[model samples]
Target chain A: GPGSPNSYLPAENEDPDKAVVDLHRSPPKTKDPDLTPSGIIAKVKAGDMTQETARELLLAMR
Target chain B: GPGSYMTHFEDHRVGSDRLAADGEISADEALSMLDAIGTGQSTPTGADD
Candidate 1:
């Protein structure tokens, strides 16, 4: 899966307890497991993620 | 993106600006300022846009 988003996509939903940001969308009452600033930054730093990748990460954080 | 705060997906601008009854901030404008930066970049792909 060279450069494929499949692996990354699943990782997005892996954690649902963290905090996230989605200015363009409405906020939800329930919390996500992987929705935190620290988590997002960690993922990006670890994966060498791009903005688009970060976007998905943010969505997961959502 | 309207009226969403402290929950999820919401702008957080509201939540950050208007504190909740039991919620918390960094006192003064520190948390708000940090939120400004956090929410701004992590928001709607604005990180690069």
Candidate 2:
């Protein structure tokens, strides 16, 4: 695997608890959007996204 | 996402402590509820979405 910080993806069997907590970390990526709902939420928490944007993303989820 | 607090997801994370303090639910239960509600991203492949 690459060492680029931005390129990291959690291992498939990584602990679920850690995965949940990781969502609060910043700068969630779009390449694997559905993999990290918390990441998107964190984006909104930082005001990087509008409520409308967040709403749309969440609704389109599924 | 309508009528959602938007921050309710965050609330569930922090509020787990509050709910535990009130003895209404354990912190695990609060977190589990969030997962059950499809917000926790607990599933592989993010299939819950």
Candidate 3:
């Protein structure tokens, strides 16, 4: 419990979904449960992240 | 970091871009945003890199 889970670390409270960035990795990394994959996708929707960088991050994701 | 973002991630990026903006930038140009969006940071340190 610290300020609503800053970034991808598990939460003090249980989550409502079933997924992680790396299920293969022993301890997986991920984003806020509420955000999920779509939330980050939404990242490009607003603000200035619509640059080519997100594409790489997106690709790097692969 | 190779194929279609929407295709690889399978979440939304491909269409999300076109949804908000008129059209999503190509995958090659979009690569730079990894950090600007902060996904890159959240990605690695939190083991996102």
- i-RMSD per candidate, Å: 8.7, 10.5, 5.7
lDDT of 1 by residue, B1-49 (tens): 5555556574334543443233332223222223333333443552553
- Count the clashes in each prediction: 17, 1, 20
Cα lDDT tens digits for candidate 3, A1-62: 12333576764745568534343435466533232333345666565445454454556543
What are the DockQ scores of the candidates, in order?
0.03, 0.02, 0.11
Which is better, 2 or 3, measured by DockQ? 3
Model 3 residue B37 distance off true place after TM-score fit, in angstroms: 15
Better of 2 and 3 by TM-score: 2
Predicted complex 1: DockQ: 0.03
Best by DockQ: 3
Q: Give TM-scores for every candidate, taking all chains together and pairing residue i with residue i.
A: 0.21, 0.27, 0.23
TM accuracy, model 2: 0.27
Full candidate order by lDDT, most accurate first:
2, 3, 1
Highest-scoring model, TM-score: 2
- Tell the DockQ for candidate 2: 0.02
lDDT per residue (tens digit) for residues A1-62 in model 2: 22337767767655766454433345656554562445445565565766566555655652
RMSD of 2: 21.3
Query: Which model, 1 or 2, shows the larger TM-score?
Result: 2
